[PDB]
């Protein structure tokens with residue numbers, strides 16, 4: 122019925138607003154999975170125009186409108202769950218840009234200190250990255266306290282590198298912390314499931330997994346599995362280009378032997 | 383080297399120890415991926431016998447021995463596509479292995495549970511966090527601990543209506559077992575999520591779900607091992623959503639309340 126309201130309330134809109142209004146009507150199902158940056162790009166308008174339209178429909182902004190749009194459209198298990206994750210792995214392996222991956226490998230190799238940022242289900246992905254970095258002997262820290270991450274990002278200096286782990290690239294405190302590093306000329310690598318988002322303007326490099334999240338599918342295993350695959354490839358490529366990291370894999374494995382039963 | 387020492391220094395070993403020395407000398411590649419509980423079973427000897435072999439050989443115990451073993455063995459196309467392919471094979475292997483009778487029972491325990499405690503360290507922290515996250519999406523109270531002191535203290539006072547998940551590929555991590563063991567001993571259900579059928583943890587588990595690809599001393603954290611542990615988490619919560627469609631209201635409401643935390 123929010124569609125019914127859009128058509129009905131479309132009467133008073135200017136040309137640019139009606140372009141976006143028309144776009145959303147004809148692409149309702151796909152817009153669930155688009156960021157504000159996507160919708161502005163796809164309509165050839167601006168983010169300011171999208172927001173202005175969402176406000177005219179009664180909403181606080183784009184995220185709020187998209188949430189309503191998702192609820193509006195929504196109105197064997199082991200094998201389906203597994204197949205959906207196999208598909209996303211495959212799709213992600215096709216999408217991976219090898220040249221940006223190779224630059225990212227060199228950035229990590231050169232980094233003295235790696236900070237990672239991510240909340241909600243992205244906290245799982247950022248944790249796996251920091252663990253895998255620690256396995257090869259890098260200093261890495263994962264923050265879900267976005268206040269502490271903003272404060273670290275704000276004093277960041279040559280030698281540091283940041284990963285912003287966010288499927289949507291639209292999470293306010295994650296973007297804020299990442300942007301502080303970016304504005305200081307610190308490399309920021311984003312791990313996302315969407316090509317264009319607010320975070321992309323604040324990233325020096327991006328890896329993109331398959332299956333963008335919508336309002337009702339955050340944390341979906343199909344979206345998270347591709348993001349974890351980005352982490353896996355990155356650290357295995359580091360291991361391949363710099364075999365000396367294998368000494369660290371070995372030593373970190375040895376020192377937790379005394380922690381076994 | 384450890385393998386040469388096993389060979390030559392085994393003259394002085396007893397028959398019982400010889401059986402274990404012989405099994406290892408013949409199966410050494412696979413022994414990397416076995417728990418003390420497997421080596422004992424596969425040789426039909428006690429875990430005490432296996433330990434005695436290990437210490438006779440100058441190691442602290444089975445895990446120390448198994449680590450030297452993997453290092454001793456160690457001296458004998460595109461990276462994206464191979465890393466993705468392993469994870470594919472692991473997912474499909476885990477899917478075929480899933481015991482659907484256990485899974486249905488585990489779903490019902492979760493449904494009944496008023497409080498869910500989750501325990502895991504190192505790379506298993508990632509799996510336990512995903513579980514607690516997916517629980518919180520359906521409106522369950524779930525806490526993930528990697529502080530194993532805190533996890534021990536909570537488990538030790540655990541009471542009717544609680545349920546624990548012990549996340550460990552090996553089921554052999556000392557402080558994780560200890561905390562799971564405390565709940566188990568107070569008759570509170572414990573569900574283990576591992577990548578091995580037999581382990582110290584299995585004898586302290588009400589139920590178990592087993593992912594493919596057992597970890598070895600030099601492959602802890604491998605994405606092909608973790609990807610199947612995460613698939614178990616997904617299938618668990620998706621079954622719940624299928625049996626108890628009312629959980630979809632929490633999925634929606636948990637999605638709604640984080641909208642004001644987006645940039646737009």
Ligand SMILES: CC(=O)N[C@H]1[C@@H](O)[C@H](O)[C@@H](COP(=O)(O)O)O[C@@H]1O
Pocket residue numbers: 240241242243286287288289290291292295334335336337338339340636637640
């Ligand atoms: C759509 C949705 O449910 N969002 C919530 C979580 O599920 C999600 O994991 C997290 C991080 O979002 P990201 O920054 O896009 O990964 O954001 C929100 O708390």
Ligand SMILES: CC(=O)N[C@H]1[C@@H](O)[C@H](O)[C@@H](COP(=O)(O)O)O[C@@H]1O
Pocket residue numbers: 373374377503504505506549550551552553554555558597598599600601602603
């Ligand atoms: C073999 C190995 O390196 N083990 C280390 C980690 O990589 C592993 O994730 C953790 C928990 O292991 P689990 O309890 O078997 O999951 O134990 C060890 O710190």
